[PDB]
């Protein structure tokens, strides 16, 4: 019952070299082949290669000129070095056994992009007359132009949870993501209560408390 | 390089029915070496069937594999609630381990109707340099939906993008939001804006339009 | 018209590399020169350099060996890289047109100092018998030893608005800042109403409601 | 590298009064390519005069430039309230762009009297390990205030820092506070603490002091 | 009277390199030896090495093949480079004079562990009838898994601060810390007033408030 | 590499009482080059004695040191409140500087009694797959406190870890919590859970167990 653990650099820039390491615990490490499996959105699971304790390596013919692997028998570690990463190598990388039939890793999301850290610029989303459909409305606060992926959006400091729909971030053609968060409330609630969305973004330490004004 | 192809990825079945999955391969897989993986969201894949007929240890009996040659099938007799994930088929009879495209199963429910809402760009966003117009669809089960934007009563293609949320954990419904990213000059040079939505829950498509300059 | 948006690393440490980016909107990007202008306290406006869509660069002879500029025509963005920043690079950086005759950016306050993030230590400023001139007094609460620039001082949750005097932050010879905030109130009202100065510091995530004791 | 020099930056003029500024360059500006910039607090600079004689589009005619060769001047006919900012002059007829030192104009009013207050260090600061003595001035118009700390009837220089408040938006006065930080040994070995406040609004300089040991 | 301020990466992963820098302010920087001293839990203070303005280095025989200091006379700074850090390098690093007699640094905690950031999980702990000896019992929620060290557990948002004991974090074998906090309150007060163990994991931005009662 | 050793692991003396320390070295120091450091929690170490006999500048005369050869003693005449920290000793007469193992001093008071509290695993964490059993002690002065976990009237060791809190600043006592980890089937089939406590507060050890299935 091995417990594979992974680590490596998440953010990367184009034309650099990806480097990941997977540590093996539990039972014996020698006399086995250790695989690297890459899963990307749009595509499916992809097999990268294998390596054993003796340094013998098997490579996927497609990713053969850019893949280099090394094994460290001293500390029970094997590593992957994908060279000249482009924007198409943004995926989730796994480490498993030779066939990935018994035990897998945990996954290490690796994103390749050329952009500096930016703070989100939240904008209000006014509920128009058409939004006020008698007993239902549609609020929100569009969150735009932040580079690092993880952004968490709340409402009324977590007081409001029903109807909240935080849509997935979308990478536009500027290197920066965009996110939306909305909630539906009755019109009387609009006229009798104030709503603020507490967008926060750790890599820039910028948290905003924009209030939606009807 | 045996290219594995599967059934459509949007297979939908209510809990309590039989699920059929196909992994038509490119060539005859040696010794019927085909494995059926399952990947729950946020986790790593797990074996269910090895050898295209035998289940892995620790796997319940609801998963039954079959098939030989270039046509394989994985059958789930009773779709339990914790079985709606993405299933991949892997062939290990050839040197490069090739995984299938993967198909996912989701809960089936009665058809609903989207709650369409549109919004105008904010003043601060407008002075920032760009104008974003977004119209939203709320609580519709059939994931298939088309949003067609109309600017000055003209069709706009490619100048927009949309995102969808995952299946709801309470009523099993989706939500769609489509944004119309437009420049300040282009936004201020047009009169009317609307997005057309088509869904099988509404026989007549509904178009919601707003005019810039008044609220 | 054009609208320029700026983003970059605000807080820095000595011997690092400053990296700022500016985005061009509204009008065309190609066919002009884009400038970087620095405004340091004590000194005046300084012109750092220029770059166009073809990578042609002009540099100020003062900041010649440390300034490196790059352009990205695809995304309509240009960037500045100031290498081996010292404590003299604390200033406000602007991105503008050819010579800044038409349109400027907003400004990115960049500070270079070797000091860890610290939280404010607010002390009561008791009204001395000399300061209590019968009908005129002066309360306040000194704030000391906080490294990051931003800090806000309130009074009774914003109830006190008239008579407040928030002095500018002063950097002593320790790499940290010290700020004083005072308010003037009648001596009789000192014992009647409770005056609490609500000082908070965003980088350290603190909210102190210390009471002034005579 | 044309070094630019300007008139003293403490030019104080009453509202509705003609204002003049100087931009004496170090050499002869080519073709009178000299521009005047105005920067209100918190914003980027904007043009007023380009070519040292012609006002930029979108600026009221109250701003008039003059001069040629090496010495240049800027003239304001009427001092509107939205004109009290810092004015920079820039030349664009050489290889490196150079800006001036910048001169600011503020509201001129009647002289006021600095309300002086003294605050002894608190006990928790003493137990922390440092002692800081602050004496404050309230509602004095002129910028100059030579507050010198006198301790033990001796001369102390350099062991103090001062803060100056910006223009007041209601009555246009200042507020200056100076802090006298000292070590615990120096704090407890000295007997009298005072800051010598001097002002042109008071004919005879005055001083307030406190002594450690009484309250 | 010199001021020794230091900065460096406070978190690391195995098989990586450790970089620290210390800055000297005030008196002269040349004509002296600058030392790096490590204080590890369990063990005691350890002397790593020395360096002067000319690059002459003294080394600890134990940490001889992995330690490398460098000096930057231009900006009055010296640095430490520890290569191939393992889990045994988790300690606090100081920069001081040659013998550490006059002036020391501030203390830069460095932790080496191959674990990704994970959100804490709160497990309520009901007060047993055996625990309730009439009116004396103990409440609490056991936080199980969280990678980064900083975490705070408070009761009633600071209303209940009496009788609260916060035990130190325990590093589990998986690489995830564990913390337990309990409160001693009368049974009558427990019945009348509900208590919530608020948590605020800064790295994960998780604010989970769980109330547990008999 | 002169290995440096300190004999008293944890000295505990009442305030205002003389304290003596030992820094037995492994070799003979060159010229009595041995120093004594003091490290208040959260701060950097600070010198008190240099040369094994002389006081550092600014150090109160309450600190005195002596000894030569391979035995060195540090003597504190009066234990002031700002004296309870860890004390390290350092040598110079060898190429690598070597510090002592470190010894700490704390305030002494009467012996208290541990209040044993026992808690069962929660259902949520049992579902998660971890069965954690914890027993706590509250407000006991002596540092020594042993937790002997017994499972089904058997002896088990090495499956538990102990956490100790820093001394309370009001009553000057300690609180100890020990966590016992268990598996799924092991917790499911085992019946009786208890931890044994040995302390000098009570001559007769006290045990308080529980059973799973009833409360």
Which helix (DSSP H) or strand (DSSP E) does residue D173 occupy? none
Burial class (CB in 10 A: 0-12, 13-18, 19+), A99: middle
Measured between alpha carbons, how far is D136 from D176 in angstroms, rounded to an integer?
A: 6
Domain ranges of chain A: 3-112, 121-208
Helix (H), strand (E), coil (C) string for E136-181? ECCEEEEEEEECCCCCCEEEHHHCECCCEEECCCEECCCCCEEEEE
Partner residue opposite B122 with nearest CB, options A106, A123, A133: A123
F65 shares its domain with F97: yes
- Tokens 């809990």 -> residue: B15
Pairing of the two strands D206-211 and D192-197: antiparallel
SS3 (DSSP) at E9 = coil
Query: E strands of B46-109, at which residues?
Result: 46-50, 54-55, 63-68, 71-76, 86-91, 98-99, 103-106
Q: Are B192 and B209 in contact (CB under 8 A)?
A: yes
SS3 (DSSP) at E29 = coil
Q: Name the phi and psi angles at A142, rounded to 5.
A: -60, 130
Query: What are the residues facing F88 on neighbouring strands?
Result: F37
Q: Residue length, chain F?
A: 215
Where a domain ends, among D107, D141, D156?
Answer: D107
Q: Are B101 and B10 in contact (CB under 8 A)?
A: no
Q: In this structure, what DSSP letter does residue F159 have?
A: S
Angle E7-E9-E13 from CA coordinates, rounded to 5°: 160
Which chain A residue has the Cα nearest residue B130? A144
Which chain E residue has the Cα nearest residue C205? E202
All residues at 6 or more sequence positions from C114 whose CB lies less than 8 Å from its CB, including other chains:
C13, C14, C175, E5, E7, E23
D140 shares its domain with D205: yes
DSSP class per residue in C74-106: TTTEEEEEEES--GGG-EEEEEESSSSSS-B--
Measured between alpha carbons, how far is E69 from B165 in angstroms, rounded to an integer?
A: 52
Q: Which two tokens stand for residue C68?
A: 């490196």
**Among F111, F103, F82, CA closest to F16:** F82
**CA–CA distance from B15 to each of A112, B83, B142, D49 (Å)?**
39, 9, 16, 76
SS3 (DSSP) at D126 = helix
User: Span C121-208: which CATH code?
Assistant: 2.60.40.10
D120 shares its domain with D100: no
Total count of domains within chain D: 2
**CA–CA distance from F194 to each of A202, D16, D123, F182 (Å)?**
44, 89, 51, 13
How near does any CA of chain A get to the CA of C55, in Å?
A: 18
D37 shares its domain with D101: yes
Measured between alpha carbons, how far is C81 from C24 in angstroms, rounded to an integer?
A: 18
Q: In this structure, what DSSP letter does residue F6 have?
A: -
Measured between alpha carbons, how far is C100 from D46 in angstroms, rounded to an integer?
A: 8
**Among E118, E117, E205, E208, CA closest to E154:** E208
Q: Within chain B, how many helices (H) and strands (E) appear?
A: 2, 18
SS3 (DSSP) at D32 = helix
F90 shares its domain with F19: yes
Q: Are E156 and E104 in contact (CB under 8 A)?
A: no
Which helix (DSSP H) or strand (DSSP E) does residue C149 occupy? none
DSSP class per residue in D50-97: ETTTEEPTTS-TTEEEEEETTEEEEEESS--GGG-SEEEEEE-SSSS-
Partner residue opposite E168 with nearest CB, options F122, F138, F165: F165
SS3 (DSSP) at A192 = helix
Pick among A4, A7, A23 to test the E interface (most E CBs inside 10 A): A7
Partner residue opposite C168 with nearest CB, options D117, D125, D163: D163
E3-112 CATH fold: Immunoglobulin-like (2.60.40)
- Residue F4 falls inside a structural domain: no
Where a domain ends, among D50, D82, D107?
Answer: D107
Residue B203 CA, distance from chain mean position: 23
Measured between alpha carbons, how far is D90 from D72 in angstroms, rounded to an integer?
A: 11
Which helix (DSSP H) or strand (DSSP E) does residue D164 occupy? strand D161-164
Measured between alpha carbons, how far is E51 from E43 in angstroms, rounded to an integer?
A: 24
D101 shares its domain with D128: no
Measured between alpha carbons, how far is C197 from C90 in angstroms, rounded to an integer?
A: 30
D29 shares its domain with D50: yes
Does A140 reach chain B within 8 Å, measured CB to CB? yes
Q: Are B161 and B179 in contact (CB under 8 A)?
A: yes
Helix (H), strand (E), coil (C) string for A56-91? CEEECCCCCCCEEEEEECCCCEEEEEEECCCHHHCE
Structure method: cryo-EM
What are chain C's partners, defined as 3 or more CB pairs within 8 angstroms? A, B, D, E
Q: In this structure, what DSSP letter does residue B184 have?
A: H
Q: Which chain D residues are within 8 Å of C5, Cβ to Cβ?
A: none
Greatest extent of chain E over all pairs of C-alpha atoms, in Å: 72
- Residue F5 falls inside a structural domain: no
D131 shares its domain with D196: yes
F63 shares its domain with F135: no
Query: What are the residues facing D107 on neighbouring strands?
Result: D13
Q: From the CA atom positions of chain F, what is the Rg in Å?
A: 23
Q: Name the phi and psi angles at E69, rounded to 5.
A: -100, 150
Angle F82-F87-F92 from CA coordinates, rounded to 5°: 135
D125 shares its domain with D99: no
CA atoms within 13 A on the CB side of C31: 3
SS3 (DSSP) at D12 = strand
All residues at 6 or more sequence positions from F125 whose CB lies less than 8 Å from its CB, including other chains:
E123, E142, E144, F131, F132
D103 shares its domain with D119: no
Measured between alpha carbons, how far is C209 from C195 in angstroms, rounded to an integer?
A: 10
**Among F184, F124, F154, F141, CA closest to F10:** F141
Measured between alpha carbons, how far is F195 from F179 in angstroms, rounded to an integer?
A: 10
Burial class (CB in 10 A: 0-12, 13-18, 19+), D28: exposed
Resolution attained, angstroms: 3.2
CA atoms within 13 A on the CB side of E50: 14
Domain that includes residue B166, residue range: 115-211
Q: Which two tokens stand for residue F67?
A: 């000894």
Q: Which chain D residues are within 8 Å of C104, Cβ to Cβ?
A: 44-46
D123 shares its domain with D194: yes
Where a domain ends, among D107, D123, D146?
Answer: D107
**CATH number, domain at B133?**
2.60.40.10
Q: In this structure, what DSSP letter does residue D136 have?
A: E
E121-211 CATH fold: Immunoglobulin-like (2.60.40)
Partner residue opposite A128 with nearest CB, options B120, B128, B177: B120
All residues at 6 or more sequence positions from E205 whose CB lies less than 8 Å from its CB, including other chains:
A152, A200, A202
How near does any CA of chain A get to the CA of E57, in Å?
A: 30
Q: In this structure, what DSSP letter does residue F82 have?
A: G
Which chain E residue has the Cα nearest residue C88? E75
Measured between alpha carbons, how far is B4 from B24 in angstroms, rounded to an integer?
A: 6
- Tokens 């409140």 -> residue: F81
Q: Are D30 and D98 in contact (CB under 8 A)?
A: no
Q: Are F65 and F1 in contact (CB under 8 A)?
A: no
- DSSP H helices in chain D: 123-128, 184-189
All residues at 6 or more sequence positions from E86 whose CB lies less than 8 Å from its CB, including other chains:
E14, E112
């Amino acid at each position: 019952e091995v417990q594979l653990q992974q680590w490596g650099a998440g953010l990367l820039k184009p034309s650099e070299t990806l480097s990941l390491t997977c540590a093996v615990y539990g039972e014996s490490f020698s006399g086995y082949y250790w695989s690297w499996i890459r899963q990307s959105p749009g595509k499916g699971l992809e097999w990268i290669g294998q390596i054993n304790h003796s340094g013998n390596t098997n490579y996927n013919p497609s990713l053969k000129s850019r893949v280099t692997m090394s094994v460290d028998t001293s500390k029970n570690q094997f590593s992957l070095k994908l060279s000249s990463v482009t924007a198409a190598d943004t995926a989730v990388y796994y480490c498993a056994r030779e066939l990935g039939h018994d035990y897998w890793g945990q996954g290490t999301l690796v994103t390749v992009s050329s952009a500096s850290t930016k703070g989100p610029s939240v904008f209000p989303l006014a509920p128009s007359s058409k939004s006020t459909s008698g007993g239902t409305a549609a609020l929100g606060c569009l969150v735009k132009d932040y580079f690092p992926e993880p952004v968490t959006v709340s409402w009324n400091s977590g007081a409001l949870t029903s109807g909240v729909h935080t849509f997935p971030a979308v990478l536009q053609s500027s290197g920066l993501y965009s996110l939306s968060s909305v909630v539906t409330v009755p019109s009387s609630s609009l006229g009798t209560q104030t709503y603020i969305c507490n967008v926060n973004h750790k890599p820039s330490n910028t948290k905003v408390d924009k209030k939606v004004e009807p | 390089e045996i290219v594995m192809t599967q059934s459509p990825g949007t297979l939908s079945l209510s809990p309590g029915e039989r699920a059929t999955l196909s992994c038509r391969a490119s060539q005859s897989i040696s010794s019927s070496y085909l494995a059926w993986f399952q990947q729950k969201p946020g986790q790593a894949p797990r074996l269910l069937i090895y050898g295209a007929s035998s289940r892995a240890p620790g796997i319940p009996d609801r998963f039954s594999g079959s098939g030989s040659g270039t046509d394989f099938t994985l059958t789930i007799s009773r779709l339990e609630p914790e079985d709606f994930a993405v299933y991949y088929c892997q062939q290990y009879g050839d040197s490069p381990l090739t995984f299938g495209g993967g198909t996912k199963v989701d809960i089936k429910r009665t058809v609903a109707a989207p709650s369409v809402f549109i919004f105008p760009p904010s003043d601060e966003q407008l002075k920032s340099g760009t104008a974003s117009v977004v119209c939203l669809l709320n609580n519709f089960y059939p994931r298939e939906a088309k949003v067609q934007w109309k600017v000055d009563n003209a069709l706009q293609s490619g100048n927009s993008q949309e995102s969808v949320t995952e299946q709801d954990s309470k009523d099993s419904t989706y939500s769609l939001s489509s944004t119309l990213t437009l420049s300040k000059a282009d936004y201020e040079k047009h009169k009317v804006y609307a997005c057309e939505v088509t869904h099988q829950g509404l026989s007549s498509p509904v178009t919601k339009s707003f005019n810039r300059g008044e609220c």
